[PDB]
RNA sequence: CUGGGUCGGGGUUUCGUACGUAGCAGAGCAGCUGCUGCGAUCUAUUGAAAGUCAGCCCUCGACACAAGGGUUUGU
RNA sequence: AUAGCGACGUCGCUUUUUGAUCCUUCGAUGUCGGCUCUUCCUAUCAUUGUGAAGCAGAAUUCACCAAGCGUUGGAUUGUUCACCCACUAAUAGGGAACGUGAGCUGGGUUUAGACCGUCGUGAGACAGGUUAGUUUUACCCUACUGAUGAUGUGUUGUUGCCAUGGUAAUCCUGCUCAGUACGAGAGGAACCGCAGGUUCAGACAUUUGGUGUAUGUGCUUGGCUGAGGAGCCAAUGGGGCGAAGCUACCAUCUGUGGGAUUAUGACUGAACGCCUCUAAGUCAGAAUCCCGCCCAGGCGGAACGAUACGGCAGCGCCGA
RNA sequence: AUCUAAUUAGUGACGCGCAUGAAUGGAUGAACGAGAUUCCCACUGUCCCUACCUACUAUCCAGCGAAACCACAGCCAAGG
RNA sequence: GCAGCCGACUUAGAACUGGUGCGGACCAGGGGAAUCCG
RNA sequence: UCCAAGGUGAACAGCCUCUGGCAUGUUGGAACAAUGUAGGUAAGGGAAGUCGGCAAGCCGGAUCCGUAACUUCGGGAUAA
């Protein structure tokens, strides 16, 4: 018989294999479509989630009440030390797909990048690329790889720069740097390749990859929650209190004659640690890391033109469970996937956006830096001491 | 922004934090957190709560 | 020109609220919330500035045993303004209006929330205090 | 000559002002001819005391430790 | 007569009503409803695209492609049904052993106790009423949800491709258009913009709220260590405030582009000197369909790195 | 008629009573009832709409170790 | 009728005082209006 | 069936202790997932849940005030 009362089904089957992700680093499933008209540029970046805070900003959108008003918005801090470009890989279209053709690696590879090639760095003898690197300082190897570059230029249609992050500058236990292939979108393959070949073994800051008030996508892995029941995995209705064999379950699995449990029925299992791609996150600020300028260091990377303080983006006592950020960061509106100190992939927008929200300019007037390790009360230590006065400890 | 004072504790309220309260007879009050809010609702007099700016001012502590 | 922002709603069907006017009614029994489509098992709930249907459970005899449109002007559930302040009042209270919008009474006792005020201009005229 | 680890020190934060001592502060009461005792509480030292990673932040202070152990894998 | 209906007739379809039969089951297939949850059908209530009105506008009818997405909250009753109140865009109808009791409940039917009415001389009967009446078992197989792993590439590692599966967004209001088109008047639209919201989905913890045995810090009852100090016991003694962490439309963030086309409207144009959207050929065309975005990644491949002592040795390539 | 926004419920009346009725007892009734029903106040996680915490399990390990059941066994659609 | 010496728990009133908390753990009746039956 | 301490307290109630007794009830270790069993707390609403306020929750001792309808005059009554 039919359902007496209808109701939309719980959950979505678009994310159906609710399994633990097979990968820990977010994977770019699709890069922005290439067009030779635009100049060469990268299309993705790697950052690390640090924490969240407030911003107070003026709103400019005719029609709404918030027009000519100021509102507070939650923002997420992503630390993004500059990447290091350590190779290029070519791809050629085949009727069976997009097959990789050839990879070329730089002469010098940092040991923090070589960590990725070993499951146990301590017991290893660190012999990776030792014989490969000899191809660059001999005429045989030079003419071996120059015609390889020529063949890649001739036969390849996709070029992706193989670049690794720089975990030496992060306040994390891990020293094994991540690495990924960032597709190069720009002119024809010839200049697309001879533009990367000098970016090889060099720095790439995020300021020249992304810009302010731009809409990007974040690809990551959700926070793991382990084995969870159906009422928390799928948010089904909780059974009444009089139920005998438990109430946090689903009453009827299915009908009789289908004679099987369908894949569409909610079941208990793994929750969290899924791979997710969230689009349309707006950059609010591309911060500037600590730098020594004539003896003293410049630290006011969280000082706006309306605040004029000397406070860094780090809150009092640093970010809880992450540390303090000293490198150039990216401030994203709203929340992003993942846990603290989790690696995130920043990806340029796949869509062309012509909308008020997308094109709105952003001008912050206050960044909250109060402590998050409890109910913070003071923006900075100087103002805290000024308010409190001298204490017994001194 | 309008940085402003807590009704009970007398500390400094910042835009993201705090809580507003409106009584039936007007008299809008502002609280830093649930601590001060619960004290005010239970009608604790700030003059006898040690960590309050009112108590410190009344007892001439600091300066 | 600007529709109200979403605010938390803490007055489901079956709540009795104060009637802050001079119509003589002292109670307002929320009956249903106008503009609510709802889903399975989900009670219709109303917040500040939402028109509801209400019955008077205590007041003048001619106002009882009848269904009146009403507007909620104060709620005790904390709701977040877009500017970032969480505001909540002492009691849940509303006034009796008709379908067009103007009040059946003439004066309002106590403050009136800004969300109600800018949405129902006729109530704001009689509002003694704002927010 | 580098690494983490433990302890310690700061930062943050929670609660709310510790023990002791002093007070001609204390409803009053008892004894000795003003003094001495009992007395909840109050004031000062005292935003004091205590806790604070175990899944918080920094250290470059102390201590010892860390060039190991076992099982396999061949075109 | 045929916008819309349709008498007297007459031809059908369906098995969501009841019958008729008694083929299976009586060494037992747990026999009404409700709750929960998934999927399917279209005989379409609403939404998308259309055609026709006794379609001026508004509203409302009839019909077509069409099941993508929605189809509520309550009073009364065990109800299925029914009726009413309110909201809504709409409150369309159904199947899955009259879906679903080793999922629940057990209000109803249907044991044994009782009461009443009618019937009976009586024990007793009543698809009459009423009240109380034990709801057992999964560790097996499969299915399904997740978790190791196997399978070949000599061994391992890094970076990757995508064959295949799944698939997701939905509806409304306000403003403006505009008191305009239309209409005598009353009334009264639409597209393009702009601002929001409903339902749904995926996240997340700055902020607000919830939890709290960091048993963290005060307070406090009874007892106990001679007293102070320090503590302890009362199966978490009780009670304020509370870090971190989890967590809520009870906070906050985000939710997409094409292609061939359906209905339909057309172009050129014969058949049939004219005419004709059709016969040949051509065009526009959508909540449909397919793909993209998104989730998984094949007894499916690719590129690249390193490839086993220094007492032994094992290896790789070559010696047509 | 009242109770509610809405009442197949409840109460108060009406009586042509399928088939009420006088020790097969009729009517009423203070006090009482782990008896059966309706409404109102207070209260609350019953619910909107779920979340978190604790103890014992379940989980893994050392030791110890059964039973029900079993033609053969166990991926589906349609057909007969 | 007074003087001296012993004494057992009660009851009432007052002042002071604590962040309104005080049957602080434990022990420990929810209430009202009606109908049916006994 | 007999014997029966101290404190709190109306109490041979509950809780703590002394004399006396015992080793957690036929096993231990490590983890702290789901679902359970037994306890708790929840913003705003307050029975909208359900056949049905089932369960849970509210009240609760003592002192001083006050205590209705009805009644078999005793009660109701710890009414409220
Ligand atoms: Mg349906
Ligand atoms: Mg049961
Ligand atoms: Mg925090
Ligand atoms: Mg329901
Ligand atoms: Mg069966
Ligand atoms: Mg059977
Ligand atoms: Mg059809
Ligand atoms: Mg079954
Ligand atoms: Mg029964
Ligand atoms: Mg019987
Ligand atoms: Mg088991
Ligand atoms: Mg596909
Ligand atoms: Mg919080
Ligand atoms: Mg809190
Ligand atoms: Mg918290
Ligand atoms: Mg002591
Ligand atoms: Mg005991
Ligand atoms: Mg609390
Ligand atoms: Mg098209
Ligand atoms: Mg055609
Ligand atoms: Mg076409
Ligand atoms: Mg009822
Ligand atoms: Mg009657
Ligand atoms: Mg008779
Ligand atoms: Mg007789
Ligand atoms: Mg008789
Ligand atoms: Mg064992
Ligand atoms: Mg009677
Ligand atoms: Mg009896
Ligand atoms: Mg035990
Ligand atoms: Mg033992
Ligand atoms: Mg025994
Ligand atoms: Mg046992
Ligand atoms: Mg609550
Ligand atoms: Mg409350
Ligand atoms: Mg219901
Ligand atoms: Mg009960
Ligand atoms: Mg009584």
Swiss-Prot record, chain A:
Write out the PTM section of this UniProt entry.
Constitutively monomethylated at His-244 by METTL18. Methylation at His-244 regulates translation elongation by slowing ribosome traversal on tyrosine codons: slower elongation provides enough time for proper folding of synthesized proteins and prevents cellular aggregation of tyrosine-rich proteins. It is not required for incorporation of RPL3 into ribosomes.
GO terms of molecular function? RNA binding; structural constituent of ribosome
The protein's superkingdom reads: Eukaryota
Its subunit composition reads: Component of the large ribosomal subunit. Interacts with DHX33.
Kindly give the Gene3D superfamilies that the UniProt entry links to this protein: 3.30.1430.10, Ribosomal protein L3, domain 3, Translation factors
Q: What does this protein do?
A: Component of the large ribosomal subunit. The ribosome is a large ribonucleoprotein complex responsible for the synthesis of proteins in the cell.
Q: Which residues carry this modification: Phosphoserine?
A: 12, 303
Which Pfam family is one of this chain's hits?
Ribosomal_L3
- UniProt biased composition (Basic residues): 17-30
Q: Which gene encodes it?
A: RPL3
Residues recorded with modification N6-acetyllysine? 135, 285, 293, 365, 372
**Localization of this protein:** Nucleus, Nucleolus; Cytoplasm
Q: Does the keyword Ribosomal protein apply?
A: yes
Position(s), cross-link Glycyl lysine isopeptide (Lys-Gly) (interchain with G-Cter in SUMO1): 293
SUPFAM superfamilies on file: Translation proteins
Protein name (database record) = Large ribosomal subunit protein uL3
**The keyword Ubl conjugation is assigned to this record:** yes
Family the UniProt entry places it in: Belongs to the universal ribosomal protein uL3 family.
PANTHER family per the UniProt record, alphabetical: 60S RIBOSOMAL PROTEIN L3-RELATED (PTHR11363), LARGE RIBOSOMAL SUBUNIT PROTEIN UL3 (PTHR11363:SF4)
| Stored InterPro entries | L3_arc_euk, Ribosomal_L3_dom_3_arc_sf, Ribosomal_uL3, Ribosomal_uL3_CS, Transl_B-barrel_sf
From Swiss-Prot, chain B:
Its main subcellular localisation, reduced to a broad class, is: cytoplasm
Q: Give a GO biological-process term.
A: cytoplasmic translation
Q: A Gene Ontology MF term for this entry?
A: structural constituent of ribosome
Covalent cross-link Glycyl lysine isopeptide (Lys-Gly) (interchain with G-Cter in SUMO2), where? 2, 27, 35
Hey, what's the signal peptide range on this chain? none
Q: How is it modified after translation?
A: Mono-ADP-ribosylation at Glu-4 by PARP16 inhibits polysome assembly and mRNA loading, thereby inhibiting protein translation.
Where in or outside the cell it occurs: the entry states:
Cytoplasm
Q: Outline the subunit composition.
A: Component of the large ribosomal subunit.
Q: What is this protein called?
A: Large ribosomal subunit protein eL24
Please name the taxonomic classification of the source: Eukaryota, Metazoa, Chordata, Craniata, Vertebrata
Swiss-Prot record, chain C:
GO biological process terms held by the UniProt record:
translation
Localization per record = Cytoplasm
Ribonucleoprotein keyword on record: yes
Q: Which GO terms describe its molecular function?
A: large ribosomal subunit rRNA binding; structural constituent of ribosome
* Pfam families per UniProt: Ribosomal_L14
Give a GO cellular-component term: cytosolic large ribosomal subunit
Q: Which CDD domains match?
A: Ribosomal_uL14 (cd00337)
Q: Where Phosphoserine occurs along the chain? A: 8
Q: Does the keyword ATP-binding apply?
A: no
Q: Which UniProt keywords apply?
A: Cytoplasm, Phosphoprotein, Ribonucleoprotein, Ribosomal protein
Which InterPro entries does this chain map to? Ribosomal_uL14 (IPR000218), Ribosomal_uL14_CS (IPR019972), Ribosomal_uL14_sf (IPR036853)
Q: What is its main location?
A: cytoplasm
State how it assembles.
Component of the large ribosomal subunit.
Q: Which family does it belong to?
A: Belongs to the universal ribosomal protein uL14 family.
According to its UniProt entry, the function of this protein is described as: Component of the large ribosomal subunit. The ribosome is a large ribonucleoprotein complex responsible for the synthesis of proteins in the cell.
Q: This chain belongs to which protein, by name?
A: Large ribosomal subunit protein uL14
Please name the gene that encodes this protein: RPL23
């Amino acid at each position: 018989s039919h359902r007496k009362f209808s109701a939309p089904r719980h959950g979505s089957l678009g994310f159906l294999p609710r399994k633990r992700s097979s990968r820990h680093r977010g994977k770019v499933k699709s890069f922005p479509k290439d067009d030779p008209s635009k100049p060469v540029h990268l299309t993705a970046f790697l950052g690390y989630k640090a924490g969240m805070t407030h911003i107070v900003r003026e709103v400019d959108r005719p029609g709404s009440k918030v027009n000519k008003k100021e509102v507070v918005e939650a923002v997420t801090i992503v630390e993004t030390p500059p990447m290091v470009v350590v190779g290029i890989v070519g791809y050629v279209e085949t009727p069976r797909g997009l097959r990789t053709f050839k990879t070329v690696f730089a002469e010098h590879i940092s040991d923090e990048c070589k960590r990725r090639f070993y499951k146990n760095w301590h017991k290893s003898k660190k012999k990776a690329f030792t014989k490969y690197c000899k191809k660059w300082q001999d005429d045989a190897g030079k003419r071996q790889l120059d015609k390889d570059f020529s063949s890649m230029k001739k036969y390849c249609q996709v070029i992706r720069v193989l670049a690794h992050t720089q975990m030496r500058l992060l306040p994390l236990r891990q020293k094994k740097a991540h690495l990924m292939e960032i597709q190069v979108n720009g002119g024809t393959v010839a200049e697309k390749l001879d533009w990367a070949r000098e970016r090889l073994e060099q720095q790439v800051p995020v300021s020249q990859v992304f810009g302010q008030d731009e809409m990007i996508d974040v690809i990551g892995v959700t926070k793991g929650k382990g084995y969870k029941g159906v009422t928390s995995r799928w948010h089904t209705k909780k059974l009444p209190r009089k139920t005998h064999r438990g109430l946090r379950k689903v009453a009827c699995i299915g009908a009789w004659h289908p004679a099987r449990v369908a894949f569409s029925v909610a079941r208990a299992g793994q929750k969290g640690y899924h791979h997710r791609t969230e689009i349309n996150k707006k950059i609010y600020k591309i911060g500037q890391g600590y730098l020594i300028k004539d003896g003293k260091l410049i630290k006011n990377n969280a000082s706006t033109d309306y605040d004029l303080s000397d406070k860094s983006i780090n809150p009092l006592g640093g970010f809880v469970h992450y540390g303090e950020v000293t490198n150039d960061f990216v401030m994203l509106k709203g929340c992003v996937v993942g846990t603290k100190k989790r690696v995130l992939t920043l990806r340029k927008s796949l869509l062309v956006q012509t909308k008020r929200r997308a094109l709105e300019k952003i001008d912050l007037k206050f960044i909250d830096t109060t402590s998050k390790f409890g109910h913070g009360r003071f923006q900075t230590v100087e103002e805290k001491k000024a308010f409190m006065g001298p204490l017994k400890k001194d | 922004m309008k940085v402003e004072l807590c009704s009970f504790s007398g500390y400094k309220i910042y835009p993201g934090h705090g809580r507003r309260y409106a009584r039936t007879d007007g008299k809008v009050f502002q609280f830093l957190n649930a601590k001060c809010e619960s004290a005010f609702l239970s009608k604790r007099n700030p003059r006898q709560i040690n960590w309050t700016v009112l108590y410190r001012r009344k007892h001439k502590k600091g300066q | 020109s600007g529709a109200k922002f979403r605010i938390s709603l803490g007055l489901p069907v079956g709540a009795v609220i104060n009637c802050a006017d001079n119509t003589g009614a002292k109670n307002l029994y929320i009956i249903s919330v106008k503009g609510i489509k709802g889903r399975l098992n989900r009670l219709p709930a109303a917040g500040v500035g939402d028109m509801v249907m209400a019955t008077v459970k205590k007041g003048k005899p001619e106002l009882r045993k009848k269904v009146h449109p009403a507007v909620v002007i104060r709620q005790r559930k904390s709701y977040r303004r877009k500017d970032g302040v969480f505001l909540y009042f002492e009691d849940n209270a509303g006034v009796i209006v008709n379908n067009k919008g103007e009040m059946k009474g003439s004066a309002i006792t106590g403050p009136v929330a800004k969300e109600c005020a800018d949405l129902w201009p006729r109530i704001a005229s009689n509002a003694g205090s704002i927010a």
